[PDB]
């Protein structure tokens, strides 16, 4: 694991021996790519570089096979051949055949590690909101009052915590009646004494959540969990369920989950205990 280095042909800068087969495994750290460039190339020329050749293998494909005698036509650089790969590993192989008629001096080449911009180079952004690239990695950041989930990728608001124990109460989505936040998971816990069940009361007009997709699946969802029984998911304009919902349990979890896009008014419900 290195940041740079050189690769010289056997007996460089003098003639390379015949019947040789040397290999180099290049490895830079993760989050880095590799820039490989040749500053010297003096190898026996042949069709498809059959006899003598230097070979470059990156990842799973062959990047190049080099032979012949070529110099730098640009006076401002000694580079005659270069390669740029987005992988942290690279392979160089040099083969010389049985005999060398002329004076061939082989090759000199150098490699340096290059940073990957995970924020732009990747096909799909690794952050829900903002991506911050640095050298050897990247990190995700969130807008004000948003917080980074345990995956260090998704941002959401803090809309959990309070446990409800009162025999009657009122619960509403964040920022009600202004639009609710995105990419968040809100959790409300209602805990009544054993003799009572939790009854939820939701007015039809007090409920506006993003509509479900064409398949009928809710992207943002409101769900009531009572032990084994589940109520919902609920979606759409207007509460789909009944006005009075008997959960038949003294313990209820209300989980409102949102995705990254599409926010509407939200909801407001009331709960009350009922003797059993
Ligand atoms: Ca040879
Ligand atoms: Ca990076
Ligand atoms: Ca949404
Ligand atoms: Na050489």
Summarize the structure.
It is classed as hydrolase. This protein is mostly beta strands and 276 residues long.
Give your account of this protein's structure:
The chain has strands at 4-8, 20-27, 32-43, 53-58, 61-66, 68-70, 81-85, 89-96, 106-115, 130-134, 137-141, 146-148, 155-157, 160-164, 168-172, 185-191, 196-201, 207-208, 221-226, 229-234, 244-246, 251-257, 266-275. The chain has 276 residues and is mainly β. The protein folds into three domains: 1-116, Jelly Rolls, CATH 2.60.120; 117-157, Laminin, CATH 2.10.25; 158-276, Spermadhesin, CUB domain (Jelly Rolls), CATH 2.60.120.290. Bound molecules: calcium ion (CA) (3 copies) and sodium ion (NA). One calcium ion is lined by residues 18, 44, 51-52, 96-97, 99-100.
CATH architecture of the largest domain: Sandwich
Number of self-contained structural domains: 3
Number of strands: 23
Number of helices, where a helix is a run of at least 4 consecutive DSSP H or I residues: 0
Quickly give the structural class.
Answer: mainly beta
Q: State which percent range the strand residues make up.
A: over 45%
| Overall geometric form | rod-shaped
Order of helices and strands: EEEEEEEEEEEEEEEEEEEEEEE
Question: How many whole angstroms does the radius of gyration measure?
Answer: 33 Å
Bound ligands, named by name, code or SMILES? calcium ion, sodium ion
Which topology of the largest domain does CATH recognise? Jelly Rolls
Biggest β-sheet strands, sense, barrel: 5 strands, antiparallel
CATH fourth-tier homologous superfamily of the largest domain: Spermadhesin, CUB domain
- Share of helical residues: under 10%
Look at the structure and give the CATH class of the largest domain: Mainly Beta
Looking at how many chains there are and whether they match, the oligomeric state comes to monomer
PDB class: hydrolase
Keywords: CUB domain, EGF-like domain, Complement C1s, hydrolase
Assembly: monomeric
Entry title: C1s CUB1-EGF-CUB2
